[PDB]
Write a protein that binds this ligand. Sequence first.
Ligand code: HEM
Length: 453
Amino acid sequence: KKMPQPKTFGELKNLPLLNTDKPVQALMKIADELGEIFKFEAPGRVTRYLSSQRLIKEACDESRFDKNLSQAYKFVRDFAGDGLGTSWTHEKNWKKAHNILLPSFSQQAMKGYHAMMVDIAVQLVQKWERLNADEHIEVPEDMTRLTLDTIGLCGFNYRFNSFYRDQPHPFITSMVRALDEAMNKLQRANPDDPAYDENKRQFQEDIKVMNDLVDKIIADRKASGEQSDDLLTHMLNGKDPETGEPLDDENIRYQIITFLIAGHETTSGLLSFALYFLVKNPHVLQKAAEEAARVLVDPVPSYKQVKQLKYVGMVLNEALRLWPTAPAFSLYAKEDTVLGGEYPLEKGDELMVLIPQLHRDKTIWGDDVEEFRPERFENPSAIPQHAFKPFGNGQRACIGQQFALHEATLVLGMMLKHFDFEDHTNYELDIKETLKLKPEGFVVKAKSKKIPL
Ligand code: HEM
């Protein structure tokens, strides 16, 4: 069986297809016309994009495939180091950090972070309470303020104070430039070219900004001895049950940088896509608003109250079905194997899981796959294995899934409790692609229900 392949550009093969502002969306269109699998070649590089549950069910077999670092995350590693997201499974510090960090990311551990998530959520609500009549809300911009600040507070008890400023904290500024520089290197034909020599100076400066701040807070915390409810405390007190060793101060720094990279843009995008689908689907918004009002009976939401926001949780999952904000992940074959009984792979062959296309597999979801219907998730046990993968797969799945969903349910719950929303511009969906997806330019007007918090 020979594999489909999109149009080629002579000696560049398929690489110019990714020289665009919206690569994932272009890859989705390629998948529409070529089907569940297609070969994608580049100068000295070959991968295969998978879109169907039948094949991705096999790619998620951990005995046959392990996480691969895409070229994007190899560049990100220049400042995320061997934190969890940019380390290979076989690296000593992956398993060690995984064993140490896993209990601090459980559903149960969310009880400890709850109060500090509420702290930033109340700031978001009060900001919107304090808008004048004419004014509107820049949704992704404000959601990103919240998620950066929430990860800052719960990650290492640091306040970026994003709601007090127009230009973000220098760390946030340096991190976004670093991610941006790592992204631009993907489509950069000439290395070492002097036009980017300043890009390299800025990169090294941005790395130092990030490292200086994180190393100082770690050092300050070690001298202090203070015990807080943050991940930094757990990392300073944790030991790997396997090796018996703790994480050293450098890898702890890479973990903190990792949480901010991995968590802030994905969770921001989810809240923004969720609010977008709600205003485009007023019957769903009303149903979710009715739940928010019924459950959140106190001025400040409790951890137990957030767990009762079931429909809000279904809204978040349906937003993740349509636009998973971390839209692709890479795998490699551990040994020679046959995929789907018709595609032979050699040891080391790479695969890409195109999550937005998986989530549109009509044989799983039916024919209305493009419709926003959270009720698709009223009985999750009916969904076949590996059909819904917004948080990746296996031991290399998202360690922050419970943190992300608890924050998003908390924040969207309070939003629906406190405001009615207006799609005052009839916003047309425009999905900007960094390494993550978000709706660009999405704006709304909020009218307060005047409920004290
Ligand atoms: C809100 C939506 C989020 C989505 C959709 C998401 C998505 C993902 C995905 C798809 C992966 C697997 C990547 C791969 O296979 O290469 C991953 C891994 C990871 N995520 Fe998340 N994420 C979210 C939020 C967060 C948050 C809040 C945190 C931390 C506070 C976080 C931290 C991580 C880390 C550390 C890993 C690497 C795990 C490992 O390999 O050991 N993410 N995430």
